[PDB]
Design a protein around this ligand. Structure first.
Ligand SMILES: N[C@@H](CO)[C@@H](O)[C@H](O)[C@H](O)COP(=O)(O)O
Ligand SMILES: N[C@@H](CO)[C@@H](O)[C@H](O)[C@H](O)COP(=O)(O)O
Ligand SMILES: N[C@@H](CO)[C@@H](O)[C@H](O)[C@H](O)COP(=O)(O)O
Ligand SMILES: N[C@@H](CO)[C@@H](O)[C@H](O)[C@H](O)COP(=O)(O)O
Ligand SMILES: [Mg+2]
Ligand SMILES: [Mg+2]
Lengths: 333, 332
């Protein structure tokens, strides 16, 4: 252990907290799976903000590939600004929020409920008012997240999503992934650090490249780089990065590679090799063990990153548990 | 007033779109009736680059005017993971200027096999996409020779607006579409809004917008990277306060996309907040305050394309052939 930050401490508790969540939520997720197999959602909409939006992106890849059901993030403004009600009959809406207090999220949830959608909430604060809007609540059980930059609550969200998907689809491979998840996270905590501040010193802008599930995690990494290091980081698809943004490479760009060993490995590696040939300076992040389930590695890579980024934060003089001008509960419309 | 191909193409947009809307009236009328019969449960937009940002615009357009959930597809599910989805009863719109990238043809194929209704907004009418989808809506922008798209993006948004007008039959959208050419020409004739001096020595900036303004902010950020080599990133003014605002405690350059629609009040309040937190702001307003609110973003973008070609040339970048970029990019 290096920094004395609340963030690192919370990150290191994530594996046990996730184990406890899967135990406590096995029954509720079994029942949600049985409800969903009968209901047959036409689509899945994800309401979030912050790291809960990035979690929504992960859920998109998860449910499209494992459940074959189109999944997307909602745009709060349609409800909260334009006062519009969408046609959501027969759709599944999942509200994601550690705090469950933001007005625009609560407005979207309420509108979705009024539209006849089935509404599921992944919440960490059981006392949040979201519980009075949604149909079923799945508690994240991460306990209170005191640092401003989320760690344990994000991992708890992805595990809840994975567990819901495992129970719903009953794909035994996904079931195996969720069952192995606590051990893969613990292994990730115990591995050697992967990211160090020295690689980032004098870097004010960055591009994070990933593919598929790796892209979903990349969105969260760029946020933490912005949130706790004041580095303008941006997440891209390694496929979509070559449709315009690669010109930034020619201006000496610093790219962080989220290499996840799932079925998008060969394409991602080939795209990264192309970008390398185009002259970029690459920092490679990877899952900590090559003996992890392809669906669980995204989370293993994130565990290591959260611990190592707390130290990069402290090294750059930023306090990751109280970043400048930020709050744990952020409220917008 | 540079002699770049980008600027020449950008300045033809009002006339090209005027011809397009008339030429596409019959096909969009029929598509409208078909969609009113079909009753799509959702809309899925397949694109990459400026065709994705156009997809974001389509999301706001169809959700607010048609109450139908709209979202961008993830190509990789089909192309990299080889997975298919259940799209029976859904509308799929493939948007692509070239219509040739393998990742979008793969997604289009999978969507068609899943029973989705497939519409293509394409500029090359001799492109593979026409052999997959159920209907092609020609963008009619003419040949786009510069690498950074201008007329073809506005033509995409005009086609989307016309399709929405025909489907919903909302009298307001009909008035907006009829007024579109005049608003684009007015935007071209207006005073420049973005000047190179504001960008000198700026390597990274954030474009903040809300609703339709956000959809256009994504395109603006893309053009700033592709054409000024500036690491620009677009955010919702609501979503910026959930993390990235820490970047404002460092001196950070923010481009304000200010649309006068239902979003105006909240967005302005967010822009004022970031200003108080010390950001350095460059304001991009609509060029006329009597333009229809649903076509205001196109007028602002129209002005931006002309201004940004000159910013590029002033920044020493050739906007017609950016460093290491082709007009047709294929990634799978
Ligand atoms: N604290 C930030 C994450 O590190 C922030 O982006 C946060 O996730 C956002 O405000 C959403 O919070 P919620 O999940 O409690 O709704
Ligand atoms: N889908 C995300 C972008 O990739 C998200 O930031 C999105 O822009 C946001 O949901 C928009 O919210 P708004 O409509 O309330 O601005
Ligand atoms: N929705 C967009 C991001 O805001 C889009 O660029 C997206 O990231 C892309 O379509 C993902 O492509 P992939 O599934 O092939 O990685
Ligand atoms: N030409 C670029 C935009 O100016 C690029 O981002 C482009 O939009 C992308 O490669 C997709 O091309 P398409 O629209 O022809 O499919
Ligand atoms: Mg495309
Ligand atoms: Mg927005």
């Amino acid at each position: 252990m290096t920094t004395n930050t609340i963030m690192e401490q919370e990150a290191r508790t994530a594996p046990q907290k996730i184990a406890e969540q899967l135990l406590a939520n096995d029954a509720i997720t079994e029942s949600l799976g049985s409800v969903l197999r009968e209901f047959k959602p036409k689509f899945v909409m994800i309401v979030g903000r912050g790291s809960s939006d990035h979690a929504g992106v992960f859920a998109k890849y998860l449910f499209e590939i494992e459940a074959s059901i189109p999944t997307f993030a909602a745009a709060p403004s349609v409800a909260s600004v334009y006062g519009k009600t969408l046609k959501l009959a027969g759709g599944l809406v999942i509200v994601i929020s550690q705090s469950g207090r933001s007005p625009d999220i609560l407005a979207q949830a309420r509108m979705a409920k009024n539209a006849g959608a089935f509404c599921v909430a992944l919440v960490n604060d059981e006392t949040a008012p979201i519980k009075d809007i949604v149909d079923v609540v799945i508690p994240l059980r991460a306990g209170e997240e005191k640092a401003v930059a989320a760690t344990k609550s994000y991992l708890a969200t992805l595990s809840a999503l994975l567990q819901v998907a495992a129970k719903w689809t009953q794909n035994e491979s996904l079931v195996e992934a969720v069952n192995s998840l606590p051990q893969a996270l613990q292994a990730a905590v115990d591995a050697e650090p992967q990211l160090r501040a020295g690689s980032l010193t004098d870097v004010k802008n960055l591009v994070v490249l990933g593919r598929g599930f790796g892209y979903a995690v990349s969105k969260e990494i760029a946020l933490k780089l912005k949130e706790v290091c004041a580095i303008h980081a941006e997440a891209f698809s390694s496929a979509e990065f070559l449709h315009g943004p690669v010109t930034l490479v020619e201006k000496k760009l610093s790219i962080l590679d989220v290499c996840i060993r799932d079925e998008s490995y060969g394409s991602h590696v080939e795209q990264i090799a192309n970008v390398k040939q185009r002259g970029a300076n690459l920092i490679h992040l990877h899952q900590t063990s090559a003996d992890i389930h392809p669906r669980i590695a995204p989370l293993a890579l994130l565990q290591r990153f959260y611990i190592d980024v707390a130290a990069v934060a402290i090294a750059l003089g930023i306090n990751p548990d109280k970043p400048a001008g930020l709050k744990k509960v952020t409220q917008t419309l």
